């Protein structure tokens, strides 16, 4: 029914209202409540399905705590599902959670989707046989050490209404030959693919295409493509617009039983194309092995079990006619790691499976079809002894991780000292992963987490360490407390900060702070902070684990000192922007009018206000602004208009003012534009001016009966009132009464000192200030989004552009980033699979992995990090990124001499931050007062600011010329003050 947008906001921008409605009517059953099952349950509970039912009568064992963060040592011996239920129930008040002690086939009909973990193949076959023929979605997954599997069967006639979540393709047409050869406008890519369906609109030449009947596309070029002979109607069309149509798709899934012999694989790594077939055999062998040992799996690093396990692999391989050789070393690892229970693997598979559950209950996004086999084998430690002896259980909560990494490695993890920047979505999952792993629980271990943000309602949907009662509290503090509960050993081992990592906090996070860190982990939502942290890690030579998400997408990057390039070493696409000329007078997309509207919001309820408060604040605002602003008149008129000319006394005067704005921005300006450029206008080339991107606009005649016109008056009037502290009203009657008596001032397309002195002296208004509107996208009652939506849609009407509703405008204007628990969980798992490589001190760059994925289409891909660039300086090989000169605080002259004398190079450029300290092209007079100065002194003077008392170093960038005048790259310089 009505979705709680306040709680689901970011997730709604990923799934959509319709998908979430179907979700709310879907019950889900989850078999298995160990690490994997609880992670799946957690994400499904946060997502908002109808209800979650758990089944797992197995008693809690100490090893289960290696990944099941809702179980405690006091629960040992108690059925897992029973212990877990109340914890999951607390996640989403909208999702009831319960336990069933027994299952029956007919009982399965109560669910839209059945998830099964920790279950033998024979039991799976029985379960799936029934679900497959009873229209019940089935998903099975298991976590086995550094190996994982996921199998999906959504029935033989599953319908998918959206296979990728991508917006439909659209573009402008130039001409359409009778043969069907369509051509986009000058330098315009249609982005279509063969097989896609597109309809048309505004096509001039064949009114038939504007019908709405989608046709098949036949791409011919990035600018041209064929749709078919359109000779029947029209000989040639032009100035049209195509729009892709996303037609539903039937996906036929085979049952588990019928696909065991010939499984369809989804490959997470194209560099390991040969493994899925090997793993398919292995996971079946584990189940056959368990059957011969009363459900027990092979023991950690136990050779006898692995040999028996390998025999099952041979038999199974033969039975399904596997014409490929079994990789004995690879396969036996699955036996050796069978009991391995890693929280990173549960996060990775758990988040991915949860997304599949949502695909089954919504018909949105392409499901995994059908077998997903994964490994992160490179995560296996090599700097420690991995044996039956080191991997054997110790009756410890980390036994699940020890089974894979050993007890020796357990100590390296426990002694880690970490820095987590950001306690949001990625932050919470990471903190939970660290807690289950035993990170920093050792004597020399520690965790420092910082974030300046406080908990908000929409955060709860994917920041599971927080609860509704925590809203308004600091994220870092709450998260720290939450994980101390998940793992008591972390009590007193965590320090939370409320600092924004960056330049202003270098006093707290300085040299001493960094020196003791083992590694830094980013969990940020902006590139600026990422670049800053990266720079600092390069300076302090500390490893950096980086990650990001966007909807169902995500990525991870690892930066290793003296081995890989750093985060800032590569380029990313720029943030979305639009041509200034397009926004000002020629919009053609709803994004263009929403940007225009945001600026209008600022230019009416913010910028003018600050000017009025600055005129009543500073002593010489007029004096300064007279030569500090790029348009003195605007600042003047703002003071005048907002203090006298247009100052409202009652709300009715606000309504009157709002009515005037309507004509100013949606009528008069449009008339003036049409006057300046008549609809019949032509270019200097002879072509019609108003074609393609330029859409001939139409002025709007105000009418209170048009909803958008009305919304604008209500929003604008209410915002204006906010500026003057006047109480606003919403009773439609008041507006009608006021608007009715409005006398539209005469308008016709036209073909400073006094304004200042006529202003009341600042001292004649001391104590009186206006309240500027501060853009806040998440408060639906402040009229902000209402104003931008209305303003944008009216301009949309002016240019004949399809309007967007408040929900969409809020997303565009508010720059909201699509997000959900699923992808958040997945990146955390991948990041922690890399973290263990750092702690093992791996030196080979190919052992590391940068990951990328899009859960909406079942796409995962990995690549080795890029080696840092090397270079030679006087024979010696230098690391362009990590190597640096460590010199004392000598004077400029001295530093120049050092390079000439030692490196035999001529210092041509020296800089500190963005400031140029020295250049071999500066005037002798200038260099005269600088050369004698010490670097520190030189910086303080040039930057016109004094260093801080905590400042212990200075970073400088330098450029040098080879003795032959040529240029030679050189590492940066660290000045030890």
């Amino acid at each position: 029914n009505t979705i709680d947008e306040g709680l689901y906001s970011r997730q709604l921008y990923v799934l959509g209202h319709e998908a979430m409605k179907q979700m709310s009517q879907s019950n889900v059953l989850i078999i298995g409540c160990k690490g994997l099952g609880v992670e799946i349950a957690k994400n499904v509970c946060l997502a908002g399905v109808k209800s979650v039912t758990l089944y797992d009568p197995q008693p809690t064992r100490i090893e289960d705590l290696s990944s099941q963060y809702f179980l405690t040592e006091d629960d040992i011996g108690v059925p897992r599902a029973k212990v877990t239920v109340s914890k999951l129930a607390e996640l989403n008040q909208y999702v009831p959670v319960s336990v069933v002690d027994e299952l029956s086939t007919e009982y399965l009909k109560n669910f839209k989707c059945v998830v099964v973990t920790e279950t033998s193949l024979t039991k799976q076959l029985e379960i799936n046989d029934f679900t497959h023929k009873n229209h019940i979605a089935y998903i099975a997954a298991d976590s086995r050490g550094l190996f994982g599997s996921i199998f999906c069967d959504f029935g033989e006639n599953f319908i998918c209404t959206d296979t990728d979540g991508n917006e439909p393709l659209t573009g402008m047409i130039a001409s359409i030959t009778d043969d069907g050869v369509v051509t986009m406008l000058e330098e315009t890519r249609h982005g279509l693919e063969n097989g896609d369906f597109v309809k048309f609109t505004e096509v001039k030449g064949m009114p038939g295409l504007n019908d709405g009947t989608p046709r098949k596309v036949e791409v011919k070029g990035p600018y041209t493509f064929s749709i078919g002979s359109v000779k029947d109607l029209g000989s040639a069309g032009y100035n049209g617009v195509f729009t892709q149509v996303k037609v539903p798709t039937k996906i036929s899934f085979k049952s588990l039983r019928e696909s065991l012999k010939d499984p369809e694989y989804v490959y997470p790594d194209f560099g390991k194309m040969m493994r899925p077939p090997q793993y398919h055999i292995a996971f079946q062998a584990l189940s056959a092995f368990a059957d011969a040992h009363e459900g027990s799996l092979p023991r950690p690093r136990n050779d006898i079990d692995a040999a028996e396990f390998f025999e099952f692999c041979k038999k199974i391989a033969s039975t399904l006619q596997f014409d490929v050789e079994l990789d004995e070393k690879l396969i036996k690892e699955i036996s050796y790691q069978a009991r391995g229970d890693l929280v990173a693997m549960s996060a990775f598979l758990g988040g991915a499976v949860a997304q599949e559950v949502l695909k089954a209950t919504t018909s949105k996004f392409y499901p995994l079809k059908q077998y997903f086999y994964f490994d992160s084998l490179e995560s296996l430690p090599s700097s420690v002894t991995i044996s039956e002896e080191t991997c054997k259980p110790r009756g410890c909560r980390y036994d699940g991780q020890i089974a894979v990494f050993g007890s020796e490695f357990q100590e390296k993890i426990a002694s880690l000292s970490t820095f987590l920047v950001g306690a949001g979505a990625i932050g919470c999952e990471m903190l939970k992963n660290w807690a289950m792993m035993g990170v920093a629980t050792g004597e020399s271990g520690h965790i420092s987490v910082t974030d300046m943000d406080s908990i908000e309602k929409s955060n709860l949907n994917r920041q599971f360490l927080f609860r509704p009662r925590d809203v308004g509290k600091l994220k870092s503090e709450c998260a720290s407390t939450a994980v101390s509960i998940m793992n008591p050993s972390l009590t007193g081992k965590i320090t939370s900060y409320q600092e924004r990592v960056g330049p202003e906090s270098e006093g707290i996070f300085g040299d001493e702070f960094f020196e003791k860190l083992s590694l830094v982990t980013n969990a940020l939502d902006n590139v600026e902070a990422r670049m800053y942290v990266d720079r600092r890690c390069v300076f302090f030579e500390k490893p950096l684990l980086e990650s990001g998400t966007l909807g169902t997408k995500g990525n991870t990057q690892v930066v290793v000192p003296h081995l890989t390039e750093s985060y800032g070493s590569s380029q990313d696409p720029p943030e979305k922007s639009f041509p200034i000329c397009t926004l000002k007078n020629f919009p053609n997309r709803i994004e263009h009018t929403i940007a225009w509207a945001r600026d209008l919001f600022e230019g009416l309820f913010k910028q003018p206000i600050d000017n009025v408060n600055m005129y009543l604040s500073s002593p010489n605002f007029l004096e300064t602004s007279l030569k500090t602003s790029s348009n003195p008149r605007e600042v003047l008129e703002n003071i005048r208009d907002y203090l006298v000319t247009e100052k409202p006394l009652s709300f009715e005067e606000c309504i009157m003012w709002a009515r005037l704005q309507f004509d100013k921005f949606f009528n008069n300006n449009i008339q003036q534009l049409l006057f300046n450029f008549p609809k019949d206008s032509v270019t200097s080339t002879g072509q019609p001016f108003w074609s393609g991107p330029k859409r001939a606009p139409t002025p709007l005649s105000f009418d209170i009966h048009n909803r958008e016109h009305f919304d604008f008056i209500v929003a604008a009037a209410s915002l204006y009132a906010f500026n003057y502290g006047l109480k606003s009203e919403t009773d439609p009657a008041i507006y009608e009464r006021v608007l009715a008596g409005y006398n539209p001032p005469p308008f016709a397309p036209k073909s400073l000192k006094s304004i200042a002195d006529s202003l009341p002296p600042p001292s004649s208004l001391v104590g009186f200030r206006l309240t500027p509107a501060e853009f806040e996208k998440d408060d639906d009652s402040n009229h902000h989004i209402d104003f931008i939506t209305a303003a944008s849609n009216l301009r949309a009407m002016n240019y004949d552009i399809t309007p967007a509703d408040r929900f969409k405008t809020k997303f565009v204007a508010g720059k909201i980033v699509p997000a959900m628990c699923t992808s958040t969980a997945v990146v955390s798992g991948l990041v922690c699979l890399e973290l263990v490589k750092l702690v093992d001190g791996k030196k080979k760059i190919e052992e590391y992995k940068n990951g990328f994925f899009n859960l909406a289409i079942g796409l995962f891909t990995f690549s080795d990090p890029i080696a840092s660039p090397k270079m030679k300086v006087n024979g010696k090989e230098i690391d362009k990124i990590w190597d640096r000169y460590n010199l004392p605080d000598c004077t400029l002259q001295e530093l120049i001499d050092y390079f000439q004398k030692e490196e035999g190079l001529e210092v041509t450029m020296l800089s500190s931050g963005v400031s140029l300290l020295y250049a071999n092209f500066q005037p002798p007079k200038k260099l005269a007062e600088r050369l004698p100065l010490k670097i520190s002194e030189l910086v303080e003077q040039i930057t016109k600011k004094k260093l801080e008392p905590f400042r212990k170093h200075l970073v400088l960038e330098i450029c040098c010329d080879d003795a032959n005048g040529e240029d030679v790259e050189v590492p940066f310089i660290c000045i030890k003050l």
Binding site: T163, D164, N166, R189, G191, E193, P222, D269, F270, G271, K272, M273, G424, A425, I426, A523, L524, D525, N526, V527, R530, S547, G548, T549, L550, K553, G554, N555, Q557, S570, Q571, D572, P573, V817, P818, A819, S823, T824, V827, N850, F852, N854, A856, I857, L859, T861, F862, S863, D864, P865, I866
Partner: protein, 80 residues
Amino acid sequence: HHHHMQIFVRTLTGRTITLEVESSDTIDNVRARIQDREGIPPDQQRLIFAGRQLEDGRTLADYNIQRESTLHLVLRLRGG
């Protein structure tokens, strides 16, 4: 020696770009073509084949890129 082959470049959004190339082509050339087809600047192109990020100065052959080989064009995300 070298020879002709058809390769596929799939992006993170799921889109699939088909390319006709010669195993002798340099990674630099491929980036140039992708820029023409998609308008994406080479400096922003992160191409991966069989677990390796392709670097300039090498040829498709250097990465053992076969006929019908699929590569990935990915991006880094900033939320989370």
